[PDB]
Write a protein of this length. Structure first.
Ligand code: ZN
Ligand code: ZN
Ligand code: ZN
Length: 227
């Protein structure tokens, strides 16, 4: 029981947090989740939709329902369900942020790079100078897992942490696409994400409904069998 704007579905997770869900037409439609965060008088979004058109529908839904200007956008890694709608963000005049590796990989992965590059310390935390005015967005690089450039976002003030494609649901039987995955360090990266946000009770991911942090330990267990 949630909203729908065009081909997208929006679900409220917190008083000022929404989950946008788009689908890719192909062995059937595939869902992909992202976040919409209201920070005071501005809106922060995480990940684009599969396409530019679907991404433009996110921004028009935001304008209709929240009526706040989108300050910045942050994508997690260079894939089409994260970075497919980069052209829509730039056309909407939104500052975009990504992992420096993601922006470097973007042309090779057939994506459009973000305007800014995020860098990370040895512990995985974003260099604050590269991420100005992120508000409640706590960005963390857990290490190579689903991709070598996958990053995660936590939301301060809430019980929500976004894992992206790094995290699968607790009832999952597989890890999805492992075509560009690092199987050796996948498990340690998952557990690092769990340690980065130790108080998160709601774990949002790309290809499932929001779950508890049992999804973290479960994903780690499936990743151990690739070591
Ligand atoms: Zn991916
Ligand atoms: Zn994905
Ligand atoms: Zn690839």
């Amino acid at each position: 029981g949630d909203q729908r704007f065009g081909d997208l579905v929006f679900r409220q997770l917190a008083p000022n947090v929404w989950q946008h869900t788009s689908y890719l037409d192909m062995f059937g439609a595939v869902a992909s989740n992202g976040l919409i965060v209201r920070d005071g008088g501005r809106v922060l979004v995480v990940d684009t939709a599969w396409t530019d058109d679907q991404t433009a529908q996110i921004l028009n839904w935001i304008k209709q329902e929240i009526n706040l200007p989108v300050a910045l956008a942050v994508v997690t890694h260079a894939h089409q369900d994260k970075m497919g709608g980069m052209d829509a963000l730039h056309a909407a005049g939104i500052a975009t942020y990504a992992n420096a590796l993601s922006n470097q990989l973007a042309p090779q992965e057939g994506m459009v790079a973000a305007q800014h590059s995020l860098t990370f310390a040895a512990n995985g935390w974003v260099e604050p100078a590269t991420a100005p005015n992120f508000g409640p967005l706590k960005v963390f690089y857990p290490g190579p897992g689903h991709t070598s450039d996958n990053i995660t976002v936590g939301i301060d003030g809430t019980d929500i942490a976004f894992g992206g494609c790094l995290i699968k649901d607790s009832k999952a039987k597989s890890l999805g696409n492992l075509g560009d995955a690092d199987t050796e360090h996948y498990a340690a990266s998952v557990r690092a994400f769990g340690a980065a946000f130790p108080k998160a009770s709601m774990i949002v991911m790309s290809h499932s409904a929001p779950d508890s942090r049992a999804a973290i330990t479960h994903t780690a267990r499936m990743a151990d069998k690739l070591r």
